[PDB]
Ligand binder design. Structure first.
Ligand SMILES: *Cc1c(COP(=O)(O)O)cnc(C)c1O
Ligand SMILES: *Cc1c(COP(=O)(O)O)cnc(C)c1O
Ligand SMILES: [Cl-]
Ligand SMILES: [Cl-]
Ligand SMILES: [Cl-]
Ligand SMILES: [Cl-]
Ligand SMILES: [Mg+2]
Ligand SMILES: [Mg+2]
Ligand SMILES: [Mg+2]
Ligand SMILES: [Mg+2]
Lengths: 360, 356
């Protein structure tokens, strides 16, 4: 039929081969004559999938052996409270770097549970950049330092990560995990809802330094202890089996295209097509982020006024573009260009942007 | 290539629901995207989300003063979310123990507040549901919690107690929507979808609205999800999609009364087989408490138990091993397990007995 260009911000485009693979075996997985959705998570067929998803992640991000990979339910949002529930103990401080709305949501949940601090913030200038690591106010009693690697709503992204030695560095990487190589040992824990760059909604990937968190925290509900899930290899209660399966399939695809290093090359190229379009528009399009902080995953911009914003977005939707409206809290436009968004979608968007500009 | 899916959780699903999912997996509702590729704030997703709620409301005849929530974390997270929200100081989380899942729920409540055992058949290894006249209730109960179907022990409430001093709360994970329900008897009902309603990954919570909070984490307040119609954060969109599909299948076959007829016939096949076996197969549950959802039984000794389960597996039956905690055998016959599978099981049971 007509063209569809999927710029959805979460859940988002999946790589076709992962979907085609799921479709072909949906009724009969691994010759069992059952859907993977109909299997016991204690079955060897499911356990294979569960272990393979872990091993693919390990290999792709080169995760060290003293880290474990958890598959949890509840989304990144649940991690906002689970993290301080496990690590924010009395006398300690949950220290946050604010670089957008998701950072503020994380902070808010720690405030419910303990002492918090703000190490640095670009909130005053509306989160157009990542603050300089030299401006980080650190405390000796910090339980951790928490960052948001990619600020999904504002379109900014860490280019590199701080060296932290007084507390564990924690990162919400929901919208850029496995979009590039990562030195995992810079962190105590990384978490990401899978639905932006790793697959389907319904599972949350948590990579954790085992010894920081494999111990029982007195007074914490069993399901909310990291220890529970570490000990049981994320099989304490019933896992989201189809989501983990689809995550596996997506990881296989990333591996098949050459891994994190290759996908970073693709992601820089797609991003460049859009930012060059903005940058050659003589101010017709204005990117939210400062240039040194531009996200490779979520491109945020405005036209010169709200009327043009609306006409642009209406025209896009009529031409087959999906998900370009900015987050409801900030307006404007947002082109989400996660791993699986194809480059010809980006070229299509550029064409839209240039004809709209020329004909305005 | 014969396979009979008696898995206890996750479990068999209706073929039409899986076939429908397969067919549109790449192009949902002419959007040219998978349902998995849609934004949860899209109208496309929002209609699916609401359709799943609507079908549950219709099929269980849920009154307007109840809300239907779709949450993550399984029934296991409900074990702690419930007392987190309702077990206020000076009140008591009162539990009726009818199996090990009952025990797991009570344990989480003990973390958060005062608890109590209204009644328990544990001493007799959970062979039955206690008589309601035996319940010990308290003026300051925050709730009375029951497990409607005791998945590991094979017993099930035939009916529910009339409780007016506090909300009745029920873990219906392994029998929700296997028969008609009077939802007005309850303040809350919860169930992981993965036994009777859909794949794993979503938990259905039916809650009396006005029933349910300073200092509880945002994600763990029922009010958060009620207020946001379970769209506060990203829901498990594919699992809710599949739940919708399963609910359409149940509606199509005639609803909760029709599926009860099928379920009673399935359980009748197995229990008759056991009862007519002259003690060769022995059911764990007392007759009056027999579950229609999980049929638990053993052979006369462990070696015959093992020979049977081995023979079953060779013949294509999946999931019949009993829970590790109790051993024996367990035939899970949730909604989507077809009558033909139970007939096959019967025929295997009868042949095995003859050939022993
Ligand atoms: C979308 C998003 C979240 C929310 O994730 P849920 O799975 O919806 O809880 C949190 N952090 C970031 C950076 C996100 O982009
Ligand atoms: C299976 C089951 C549970 C556990 O559900 P999860 O989704 O695995 O947490 C709880 N209660 C009952 C009655 C069950 O059968
Ligand atoms: Cl943000
Ligand atoms: Cl977002
Ligand atoms: Cl039980
Ligand atoms: Cl069970
Ligand atoms: Mg490969
Ligand atoms: Mg193409
Ligand atoms: Mg119909
Ligand atoms: Mg008879």
């Amino acid at each position: 039929v007509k063209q569809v260009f999927n710029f959805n911000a979460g859940p988002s485009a999946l790589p076709k081969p992962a979907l085609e693979r799921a479709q072909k075996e949906l009724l009969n997985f691994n010759d069992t004559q059952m859907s993977v959705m109909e299997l016991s998570h204690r079955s060897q067929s499911y356990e294979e999938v569960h272990e393979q998803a872990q091993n693919l992640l390990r290999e792709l991000l080169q995760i060290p052996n003293d880290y474990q990979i958890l598959f949890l339910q509840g989304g990144a949002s649940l991690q906002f409270t689970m993290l301080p529930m496990n690590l924010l103990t009395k006398g300690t401080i949950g220290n946050y770097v604010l670089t957008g709305s998701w950072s503020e949501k994380a902070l808010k949940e720690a405030k419910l549970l303990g002492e918090t601090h703000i190490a640095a913030s670009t909130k005053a200038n509306s989160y157009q950049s990542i603050p300089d690591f030299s401006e980080f106010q650190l405390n000796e009693n910090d339980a951790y330092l928490h960052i948001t690697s990619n600020n999904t709503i504002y379109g900014t992204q860490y280019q590199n990560f701080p060296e932290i030695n007084h507390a564990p560095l924690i990162a919400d990487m929901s919208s850029d995990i496995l979009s590039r190589p990562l030195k995992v040992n810079q962190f105590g824990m990384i978490y990401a809802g899978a639905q932006k760059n790793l697959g389907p909604s319904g599972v949350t990937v948590v990579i954790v330094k085992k010894d920081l968190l494999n111990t029982k925290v007195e007074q914490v509900p069993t399901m909310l202890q990291y220890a529970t899930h570490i000990k049981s290899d994320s099989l304490y209660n019933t896992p989201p089996t189809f989501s983990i399966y689809m995550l596996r399939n997506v990881l296989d695809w990333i591996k098949d295209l050459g891994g994190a290093e290759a996908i970073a090359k693709q992601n820089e190229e797609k991003a460049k097509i859009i930012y060059d379009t903005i940058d050659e528009s003589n101010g017709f399009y204005v990117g939210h982020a400062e240039k040194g902080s531009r996200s490779l995953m979520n491109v945020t911009f405005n036209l010169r006024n709200e009327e043009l914003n609306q006409q642009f977005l209406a025209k896009a939707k009529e031409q087959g573009f999906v998900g370009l409206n900015g987050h409801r809290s900030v307006g404007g436009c947002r082109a989400s260009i996660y791993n699986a968004v194809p480059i010809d979608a980006c070229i299509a968007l550029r064409e839209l942007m240039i004809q709209f500009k020329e004909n305005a």
